[PDB]
Every structure is written in structure tokens, then in C-alpha cells.
Amino acid sequence: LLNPKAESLRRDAALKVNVTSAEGLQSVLETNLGPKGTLKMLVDGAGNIKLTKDGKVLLTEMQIQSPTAVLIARAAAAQDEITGDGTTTVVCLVGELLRQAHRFIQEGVHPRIITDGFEIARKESMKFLDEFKISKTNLSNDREFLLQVARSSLLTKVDADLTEVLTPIVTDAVLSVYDAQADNLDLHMVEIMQMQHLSPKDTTFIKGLVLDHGGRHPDMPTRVKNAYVLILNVSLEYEKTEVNSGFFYSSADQRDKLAASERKFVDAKLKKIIDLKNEVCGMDPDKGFVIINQKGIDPMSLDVFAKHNILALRRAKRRNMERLQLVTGGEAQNSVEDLSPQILGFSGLVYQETIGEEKFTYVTENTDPKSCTILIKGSTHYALAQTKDAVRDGLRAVANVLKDKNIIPGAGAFYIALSRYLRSANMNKLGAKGKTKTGIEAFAEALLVIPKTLVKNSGFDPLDVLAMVEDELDDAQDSDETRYVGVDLNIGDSCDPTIEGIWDSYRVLRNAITGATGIASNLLLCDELLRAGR
Amino acid sequence: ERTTGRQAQISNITAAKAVADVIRTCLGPKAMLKMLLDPMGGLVLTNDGHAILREIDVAHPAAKSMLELSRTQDEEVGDGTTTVIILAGEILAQCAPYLIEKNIHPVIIIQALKKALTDALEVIKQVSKPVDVENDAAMKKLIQASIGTKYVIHWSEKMCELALDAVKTVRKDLGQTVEGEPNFEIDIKRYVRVEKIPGGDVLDSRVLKGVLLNKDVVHPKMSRHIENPRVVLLDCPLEYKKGESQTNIEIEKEEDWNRILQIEEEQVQLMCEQILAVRPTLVITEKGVSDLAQHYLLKGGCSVLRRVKKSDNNRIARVTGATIVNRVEDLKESDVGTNCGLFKVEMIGDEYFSFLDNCKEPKACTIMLRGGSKDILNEIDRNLQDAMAVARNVMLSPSLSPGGGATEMAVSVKLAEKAKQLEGIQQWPYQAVADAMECIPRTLIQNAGGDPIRLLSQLRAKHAQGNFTTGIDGDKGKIVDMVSYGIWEPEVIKQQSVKTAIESACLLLRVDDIVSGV
Amino acid sequence: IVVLKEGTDASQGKGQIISNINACVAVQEALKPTLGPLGSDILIVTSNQKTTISNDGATILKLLDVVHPAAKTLVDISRAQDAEVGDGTTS
Amino acid sequence: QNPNAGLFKQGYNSYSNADGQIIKSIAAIRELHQMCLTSMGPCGRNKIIVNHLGKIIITNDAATMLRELDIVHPAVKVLVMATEQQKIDMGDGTNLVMILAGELLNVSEKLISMGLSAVEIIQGYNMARKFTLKELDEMVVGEITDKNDKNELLKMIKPVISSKKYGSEDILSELVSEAVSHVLPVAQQAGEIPYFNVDSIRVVKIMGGSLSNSTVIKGMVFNREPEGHVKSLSEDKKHKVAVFTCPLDIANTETKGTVLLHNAQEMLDFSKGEEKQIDAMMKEIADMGVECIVAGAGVGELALHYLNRYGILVLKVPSKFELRRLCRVCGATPLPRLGAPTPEELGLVETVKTMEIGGDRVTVFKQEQGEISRTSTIILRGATQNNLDDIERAIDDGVAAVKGLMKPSGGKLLPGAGATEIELISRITKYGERTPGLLQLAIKQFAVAFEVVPRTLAETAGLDVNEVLPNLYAAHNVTEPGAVKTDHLYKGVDIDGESDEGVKDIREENIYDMLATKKFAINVATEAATTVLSIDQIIMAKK
């Protein structure tokens, strides 16, 4: 029953290849799970190296041959637009769900029976999550907790030494842009900027913006305690006539004097700019004056500005000009003819940093910058890439907690406790079917792939860490107390995640469980593998 | 190149069995998924029987016939796509031992199949139950069956109402001994046109009774509505008037161009004054309208719409009452817009509309769909079409057939008993249909996860001794009554399904030779 | 899935030193008959299709242009002798 | 037919952790480890490099080799990038990172064979690194005081030149120290203003002769000849120098400006015009007192005739970098135009003359006891092509290392010749022994890697490591009159080539390493080693 130039898998082979493919993808990405996981290398085929642990990066930048694993990779990657994290978790859950389902299918359990059991477990799992979570204090001033959130996110991605550097940077950068009166926040208010010639441990938080083009005169101020900012769109390069003209001279003296006569047009504009400076804290102590001109500035006029203790920047990018208007509070002057103090903004400490190859201008300490900058440093591409991802991952982790006050103790406490819950509730309720229970049992066991994979990577015995957690949980249940028990991936024994400071996000756990259940079900329900024209 | 004889017969049945197999497990509320690998490297898991058959390449002409068969089913009845393909294939499979091993000539098998169709159609009627296709509430309960687990299920009262008003408007509900019974002729393809307009929400959908134009006018800014409309439908253009001669206008001297413009100005004004004699509110001209003509008519407080084809005016006249005339001097004082509440020129989503609705139903309607995005509008349109399809299928005949495999099982049992009285060579292939019908209740069991023999045997016993309304529970896999578990389907689906399935089998059984050539 | 060379050659170890010696001796063998007032002449056919006949070690080695990366050291040092002294390049 | 499991990504054969990807990656690195292993030390080995363009060079420098190698395998690229880190903001340590990082991986494999995970090994290495970096702070004996004295410079420059060129160390040290002492200002305790760019010292070489006639020029040496009639300036001081970027010929026109001739009189009139305009431009130059003119471009015949009549030395310098460097000698600013070298843009040179170096004539812009240049030029000679080219590199390394003497305690001196490395072995081991649990396994092996330096130094010197190493260890494993070791902080490898036995005191030859170089290498080498160990799989894909 087959047309030429086509192929199909009709018998159970369709399921074996779907499970096998998923098992492959699992066996790769499981090694990236947890702070003790390994680091994957990507080669772009052109000779460039990028290193990452991030599930989304691994799935979206690596090519996959197995058409079934492609479906898992895409569905898991979609989580990036929903939670921003948990991609590796989903792949691990899907793999083990298909492993456990396969074990039962071999016994004659129809894929539908497992699928329905998964849906029953999913609905009860969401109930468990809602009762398992802890409500976070609604105060945004809780820096101590927010550090724990950023730390937990960073430890997954960096070498744990950069965690000490990045943790306060992620925490304060997000809290700084967090709106007052307990409102929402947009983490796009934090600029992610890379620079070279410094070690990755030098990554730093900048209160304001950092500009690329600096001053180009040796007498430009190095640092000004407080300055007014002129936002100017008018070119200060040597101007020529707008109409047909020329320089007609009988002597070298007349030649240059005629050129100077046209140059006076720029000097007149400079006078109005300098006169403004003279009016607004002209000679006041501990004051200065900064120009961030959108257009070019003549080397002649840079000499003028430097002599007047003015820090003159030129050829600013639009993105900097628009942001600097917001940060400094000034307005863009389209014509020097209307120049007045009303144009000026204000900034605090303004200074330039000199790097072997580049200069960077800092416009920090503003009344309300409504923006932060993080400077990600390194000597290599892969070092900058890994650190950049670690910063963006932390910023999303903290922002998600500030938006969603629901926090869940981590270190596997959710997944082990949920597995125990489902096993008990299923027999207490019996609300599915005598055979459907096989799907729920498969689900409850599959949940343990996370605490098992987390510890497998740590190098501790996966069998003891589970038993130890079970022992402590049993004591809590017999004592009629609430106790959150996880695994300490540094010691190997159990721990209370709420003392260690290991937290998961509600959004991540909610969608990771729902997604993995759907993905595994979509593969289990596949009756035939069709191939035509390929 | 060429395949003949039993090799052609086996090839035709084999290919048909393959196509049926492709979607065999895609039937039922618990349909399985199918992984389709695209030549371009992608893949989908769709369980949509239409897409699966569409997106799979076939070689054998017999398989291509089955693909076109499904297209025919879709045009005739809004459902039954997969039932026809599965049944048609199984019939050919059941005819296989008779065509090849028993050496029964195709002409005998085809004749037996035609008789099996006749008997099967009568059985489907016998097991049906009536519905009152005049009771809107009863119809809403049936129509919702096509809306469940769709986005718009939360507004299903509006989706049903639109389907009820649209179908009943076009339904020919008549019976007499003169013209005869139309059998509730319904056309939801052309006479219920659906249009998607940005803005609003699902509940804001409306049904129009009249004509809606999308053509813009000379002055987009017009009174919100006209309470006393008068519409002019005129062919003659409003431009320089020429005679019946072949005389051309040729101007060489620059000063002489004024002679033609001055003549046109007088002639155009006089034509426009004749139009304004009847105090219109909307003037529609089929030919061109000169710039001067647009000003002469507009300045009087009247909308002007130029270059409108006769095919539009013929419909506009039915809902406005305006007479279509050739010459401007043929316009009548009776050209009015009475028997109408108002004409509306409201712009929706920065798009101009002209609503020519009145108090009459010109055997047709148009449905306005509303929504906050194109995605919402598309979901409303697709889901409404399902509501209209099932509304048509039910209002086409006041009868439902029991689902869950019940009807197909009843046909099998009744054909098997009828076979006992059908002495002769035809008795053998006749049974082929009775066995083929089982492919539906068998598939439902296979998806449920039960034993295809033990559960079917229980079903057959229930039909043999009990009622014909016994079927398979989609969720539990148990043999249950379709009275408690309604699962009722419009009879037209079961009648067309067995009709088209057997006819297709009869076609391929007739082909003992496939010959290439141009 | 990765390699280190993609057509990049490197050879290291004592065997390379001996290999360098063997190639360098070959140059000596080309020039050894040119030593002395009764030294023998060598026939070199150049790419320009002209033939050179000489027992002058400097002429011969400059035209030989041994390709081997190590033996070329003998060419360089002979040219140094030819520039600094003007004779003795054979020795 | 043969099935394979685990390979589902574009059909790649990509080894998992259980397949020994780490061990296989290290094996690939070992090929480069051995290549670099024989470079370190005063007796290091040479390598022949055949550039794809048909150029054969010999060098001792591992970094040169690594840049000339086409490195494909990512496991090696990690260490090659680490080498570049030693080149950025540091002038030494290339061999230290390549050799140490390889050995750290080699001993890691010994731990992997035990069943000790890459995570446990990396964690131990990070601890041993932090311990190592702290211990180095206490090994300081002396310190460079940044007085920029010739003798203080020689103390550092000599061991830096060593291991790139051996046997000429004292000659090259004088050449670098002299040139460095020329460009360095006289100052003490001044760290606010940076100075002494590496570019401040140029090296120039001519084929022929030997270093026995090498010298240092207080100024720039150009390979271009005095194109004009005047080949040298007088013995007077402060010759005014004009520098132009515009070619010394008739001015052009931005738009068209093409002259067409139809009549004989027009030819005469335009010819006189151009000659007068050029004279006016050459006259205005001379009228400012200019005695030497430097062009960034060519010179017209008429300009030569007028510049000759004005007695102006005509010297072409086509290199934009040489013109920028000329601003550091005479101070002149290149004129974007022609015929108006404003006096403020004129420079001053005391002497401009032609000199014969190696038989080749060059033009020199210099000063003697006055108006002293901010640039220096080191003059090398040598008849052998391969040797002279490498000597030039030795000069650059000396200058770069001096730059390493930076405000943040760059002057801290530790005993070299492996003495620091040996003491680290003892101290790091004790750190391991005091550390509980599996961490001690990697900390101890971390120490083991550090014996590669006294081993390599012995091997390159022709010494039997099996006698030198236990003698070095016994030399540091001694009884001292107190908790703090004194006399036996200075026992290093004796790079002599002698027969019998023994060790040598750092104090005998003032062999010291810079702390900044050592601590930097310790950071880079560990990061390189732990980076490779963290990679348990390599996957290629379209980006």
C-alpha cells in the first residue's frame, strides 16, 4: 500500500523512531541542566566559537536532522517568548515522558490511554503548583531576595566567579528601572553593551548611558562634577556658501582671509553657544558644559570649545540623541539662532574613559535617567557571548519575579513533591480509569528526570539524593508540617531551598509542565510517519 | 505505460486501499495524529483528513480519483470527507476476493453494489429520527455541535442565529402538487456572502437584508444616514453628447478647444438637471461621469457613484426600487428608495461602505463579521461557515441519523439479512458492502483502544436483537445508546457518504485497463 | 566533527632534524665535485632554456635554488660568504 | 546497515561525555603542547615556518608559530586565543600559558581516568588558582622603582631578550636599554600621565655585517634618499623643517581644470604661468626660513629646480606612520596643502644626513644633546637572513616587556629560572593536603603541572631531567634556621650545558620574572584549561 517515491512507517515502528529521536535530544541537552552542568560548543562552520548552556540558544542555533527532534526543539524554543526560561527543562520532561510512556505501550497500552492519563496528571499538577507556591512579599525594596533570584539564574549560566560580579549588576539594574508605586517594569530600559580589552570579571553597572564618540582634542575635560548639556542638531563644520561663489584673490593673504570670511559664519554660531555657557554657570565653581552635537564639529571649533572648558562631542548617533534628550531632560535645538538656556539639560559626573583602542563617554548621575547600562567586558568573542547571555538571562529572571509575585522553592523540591502528590492523589481519587492510571504513573515518574538530571551532572549518586529527600519529606508529613526539601548539589545531602536561596518562577514551572505534556502527547499520538517527495 | 486485466484491477484496489489507510485512524473524536514530512525539510502532525490527503503525493490514477472524490463530497455536503474515503476503499477491499479469486466479472460486482446502495439508502432512512426544522431553539442545539471546541463557542448564540437567518432566508421551504417539493434547496455558497470588516468583536456580527457596495463615491463625507432616500440608476454617461453619425472631434488650433468644453458644459448641466428633477439622494451611473457632472449633482446635496457595472445595478434595483434606464430622459418620478428604514454610509476601519438594506429579503443575505484583528475575523468566518454548513445539512431534510458507528452498523446488519433473499451470483459481492460498512465502528474502537473483535461483537449483538441507535462511546470505548449519548448527525451526511463511496468503488471496478498516451 | 589541519602540515621531533640533515647533505653532494683547481663542471638547464656550465660553487648553488625549507639555509649562508668574502662558497 | 545511536544532528559524528570528548579534545591539544614545549628557555629550539606566499622564516617564538599555523580544531583555538591574551596588555608569558595550560589538561586526564568528574576537577583548579595567585604575592624579592635608569632597565631587559636570542643577550640588551633610556623621561613617582608607547622605539635592519657594529640613533631613520640636490644639512642647530602631504608640484583643481592649447602663444603663456605659480609656492616656503622639506608624495621637476636653488633638502617620506612619527622628532605638522607651511607648523632638526649601514644608504633625522626626540631607532646588522629577522623580534619583545612595568605594582620581581615554579609546587601541595574531600585530588595535580618549567628548562639545556629535577626539589626541600626560607628561594635551573650536576642561584645572574606576567599567566592558563574541560561535546551548525 505505497506509491513510488514515497515511504511510510505503518506498524509500531512509527512510535519507536519518535521515542528514539526524542531520547537523543534528551541525551544531549540533559547535560546543560543545573549549575553543575557542562558547557556546549557551537561551531558556525566559518571557524567562530560560541559557548552556551542556554536551551533556546542550543536548539535555535544547532541544526537537527531527525524530523521528530525538530518538532521538540521548536516547541521548546517557543517557551522563550512565554517565560524566557525553562527550555532545557521542557526537553528533559518530554524525553522522560516518552520513555515512561513507551515502557507501558510495550505492554499493550494504547497511546490514547497514556495521553488521557497525562492530561489528568497535568490538571492536578497545576492545582499542586498553585498550592505549592509561596506568595512573595509585595515590597520592591526586598533587595536581599532579588539577589537570590539573580544569583539562581546566573549560577546556571556562568562559572560561579562571574556570579559574584553579575548578581548585584542584574539585581540593581532591574530594580533601578522598576517603576515607583509598585507598578510594572520594562527590562528594555537596560542597555546591554559589549566592549573589549578588559577581563570578564570587570563587568560593571553604569547608572546612565555610555556614548561611543568622545572628544577629539587633547584639552577636552577629563571629568566634570556637574554640567549642563546642549543638545544641538546644527553642524559646526567649516561652512561654504549655499549659492555659486568662489575665492578670488591676488595674494596668499587675500586667499586665506576670504576663506576666513566664510569661516566667520561658524564662529558666529560658536559665539552664541559660548555666550550661553557664559550665562549659565559660566564661571561658577564645580560646573561645566557639554555638547553632544548630532553633526560634525570642525577641529577648529573643537579647539575653541576646549579652550572654554567645554566637552564637545560630535556625530552622535540618532539612538544616543533621542535617549540623551530623555536622560538629560534637554531639548534638541534645530537652529542656533533660537539658542537659549531653556534648551539645556543637566547631568552629574560626566567623564571619559580611555581604552587602548577606544574612548567611552559617561553621562551618569541624572535626575531621572529612566535607563541603565551594563558594560559586558571580555577579550574573546565566546567570553563576551556567554557573559552577555548570562546578563540578559538574569535581567529577565528578576523582572519576571517583580511582575509575578509567585515564587516556588527550587532545587527539585517542586518536582519531587509533585511526583509524590500525584502518586497519592491518583489512588485516593481513582477518578480516571483502571488503565488510564498507567499514564499518571508514567507522568509522576517522568517528573523525576529533573532532580535526577540535576544531580547526575553534580556527580553525586542520583539514588541517594532521592532517598534522602524522601526521608525528610516523610518526617514532615508524619509531623503535619509544611517543609520544602530539595537537593544540595554541592554537599549531596538534602537542604531547605528557602534557606539556601534557590527559587523557580511560577511562569516557568506552569508553562514547562504544560508544554512538555503537550509535546510528549503530540508524539505519542502519532500513528504513522509519512514520507513523500523527500 | 500500460497495465491490463487483473493487474489493473489489483492496482486499482491496492491504490484505493492505500489512500483509505493513510487516514484510517484519523476518524472519530479521538483521531490520531499523522506525521507528514515535507520535501522542504519541515513536518506537521496534522490530523485534518483533508490536509493529509491533499499534502500527500500519489502516483496511481485510482488514488487520484479518491482525492477528487473527497473534493466532490466537500462541495455537496459540508461533512463526510473521511467517511467517504474510508468506506470507498473498504468496499473495494471487500470486493477483492470476489473480483480476483472467485473470478466474478466486474459487471456482476458493479450491479450487486448498485443494489446494495439502494438497500443501504432505505435503511439509513429507517433508522433516522425527525427534527422540527422550524423550531429555532431545536436547531441551535444541533448547530452548536459544529461550534464546540472552536474559538467562538462563547458566542455560539450569535453564530447559530446568523446561520439560522442566513439559511432560512435562502431556503426554499415549499410543498405542493404543482411545482413539487424543492426538498429545501439551500445555497450557502453564493446567497449568504460573508464579508470581514476590521473592528468590533465577535458579538458585533450582523446580517444584512439587501445590497452592500464597497465602491467609493465622489464625496466620501456624506450624511450618516438617509431617511428618505431616492436612488437613480442611469446608463447614459454625463459628458459631451455626440450624435448617431461617425463624426470625430479634431481640434488643431489652440483657441478652438473652448468650443468643445463650452458645449459639453451646457449638455452636461442639462443632463444633470434632468437627474436632479426627482430630487435624488444617490445617483449611480454605469458609464463615466464628467468632472462637471460630479459637481452639478454633488452640490445639490447628493452622493454620486460613477462607473458601476450593470451586474451591480441589477441587484441594487431589487432592494432600492429604482428603475434602470438607458437615457437620462428616461428617469421616472417613481425612482424612489421607499420601503426602507435608512441607507447608511458609515465608514468602518477607515473603509467606505454603502448599506442599501431595506425591509425586503431578495432571497439572499450578507453577513458582516467584526473583530479586533484579522486573526479574529478569520476565526469567526471559518467557524460561522461550519455553523452554516450544519444548518444547511439539517434544514435540507428534517431528519438526523445516529452516529458513533450506529448507522453504519445498522446498514451492515440489514444488508446481511437482505442478502439471505438475494439468490444468485450477485449474493457474493453484495455481502461486500455489508462487511465494508464495519470500517467505521471498527476505527472508533481502534482509537478507543479496545479489541476490534470483542467490542464489535457486542455491538453486532445489540443491533441484531436490539435497537439500531447503539454505538461506540468516543471517550470510554463502551457500547452505549445514542439516546443518552446523542451524537446525532444530519442524515444527508450518511446518505451522501454511502452513495458516493459505492459509486466510486463501481467506477474503479469498471477499469480493467490503464493506458498512457497523449 | 572537527579536525586540526585541513591541509596544514607540521612535522616535529628528532627525525625532522635528521631529515633536515639528509636534505642538506644532498646540496653538499651537488657541490662537492667543484672544490679545487681541478674541480668538475656542472651542467644546469634553467627554465629560460639556456644551459649553464661552471665549476663555480656560487654560480651553481644560486641556480640550484634547493626548495627544501632547511637546505635553503645552505643557500643563504653561501650568499653571505659571496657578499662578505667573495670566495670560499664551495668550502 | 550498521546502526548508530545518539547521532541525530545533520548526521554529525559528535562524541558525548561518555565517549571521551574531553580526552579526545586534550589529545588534539597535546600536538600543539609538544610544539610549544621545546620553545621555552635560553636554549629553546628553532622552527621553520613556510608561509603560503612562499616565504620561509625561522623563529623561536611560539606565538609567531601559532599565528602562522592555520588552527582548525576548537580545542586548540581556546589556547591560541589565550596566547593572544598574553599579547594584549602584556609583553611576555606566551610560552607560560601554552605550556602550563597543556600540562593542566594532561594531569586532568589522569584524574578523569579515576572517575573524577570534569566539574570536580574544574572546581579544584579554580581553588588552586586563587591560592596560587595569593602565594605569588609573597615571593617578591626586589622591586623595580621606575626611575628609568639604564641599569635598572638592563636588569629586566636582559632576561626578557633571553630565550629569544641566546649568546647575544648583552649586545641586544644594550641596544634596547639605550633606546628605552632615550625615550623615557627623567621622573620619579609620576603615574598620572601615561607615557612610553611601544611605537616610540623603531628597529631597523640591513643585511650584511653583524651586531658588532650595531648602534642606536636619536631620531628616525628613513629608507628614502635625498631626492634633491642637497643631501645633508649644515652643522648648525635648529634647521627649520617643513612637512607636506600635497605633492610638490603645480596645484590641481577640484573640478576639471584641464588646459587645452591651440596656439603657440598659449603654450608659452601657460608654461610661464605654471612655472611662476610653482615658484611662488616654493618661494613662500623658502621665505619662511625652511632648510629641509619633507613630502608625503612625489616632487615635480620644477619644484626640484626651485627647491635646489633655495638650498632646501628634499626628502620623500611616503609612509603616513613615519610622518606621524616625524612629528615626534621635529614637531612639524604635515600641511594638507602646498605653499603655506605656516611657521607654527614648522619643526626643528639639528642634523639631517645620509649614513651607510650594512652597505645600504639611509637618511637620518636626529638630534645630539638637544631638542631631543621622543622616538629612538635601534640599528641591527647581520649577514644571515633567518637569524637577523628573529633578532629584530627580540628587540620588540624587550621594548614590550618594559611597557609591562606599569603603575599597578608591575615592578615586583620574583626569582626566575623555575625557582618560583618549584616553590609553588610545595605550597600548592600543602594547600591540597589541608583541603578535605575530593578537592585535594585536583589541587595536588594542579601543583604537578608546574614541574613542566624546570623540566623544559633542563631538557632544552641538554640536561638529564631525572637528575636535575630531584636535585631541584632537594634544593628547595631543605632545613632552614626558621620557618621562613631564605638562601633556598633562589635555586633554579642552571642553563649551562655542563656534564656533572647542580643548580644555580638566581642572584648570580639576576634572573627575575615580573609578578604581573606570572599572575596574568596563571589566570589565563587556568581559564584556558578549565574552558576546554567544560566542553563535553562539539556540534557544528549553520549560524
Class derived from helix and strand content of chain B: alpha/beta
Largest sheet of chain C: 2 strands, antiparallel
Instruction: Write down the CATH topology of the domain at 210-357 in chain B.
Output: GroEL
Strand order of the biggest β-sheet of chain B: 11-10-9-12
Rg of chain C computed from alpha carbons, rounded to a whole number of angstroms: 17 Å
Structure overview:
Chain D: Belongs to the TCP-1 chaperonin family. The structure is cut from a larger assembly and holds chains A (534 residues), B (518 residues), C (91 residues) and D (543 residues). By secondary structure, chain A is an alpha+beta fold. Chain A is built from 17 helices and 21 strands. Chain A has helices spanning 13-29, 55-61, 67-77, 87-105, 111-132, 143-157, 161-177, 252-279, 299-307, 318-328, 381-403, 413-429, 437-446, 449-458, 462-478, 497-500, 506-524, and strands at residues 6-9, 39-43, 49-52, 134-135, 190-196, 204-206, 210-211, 223-224, 227-232, 288-292, 310-313, 332-333, 345-347, 350-354, 359-363, 372-378, 406-409, 486-487, 494-495, 503-505, 526-532. In chain A, helix 9 (299-307) links the parallel strand 10 (288-292) and strand 11. By secondary structure, chain B is of the alpha/beta class. Chain B has a domain at 210-357: 3-Layer(bba) Sandwich (GroEL). Chain B is elongated, with a radius of gyration of 31 Å. Chain C is built from 3 helices and 2 strands. In chain C, strands 1-2 form a two-stranded antiparallel sheet. By secondary structure, chain D is an alpha+beta fold. Chain D contains 17 helices and 17 strands. In chain D, the strands form 6 sheets. Chain D has a 4-stranded mixed β-sheet with strand order 8-7-6-9, covered by helices on one side. The relative contact order of chain D is 0.18. Chains in contact: A-B, A-D, C-D. Strand 2 of chain A pairs parallel with strand 17 (535-540) of chain D.
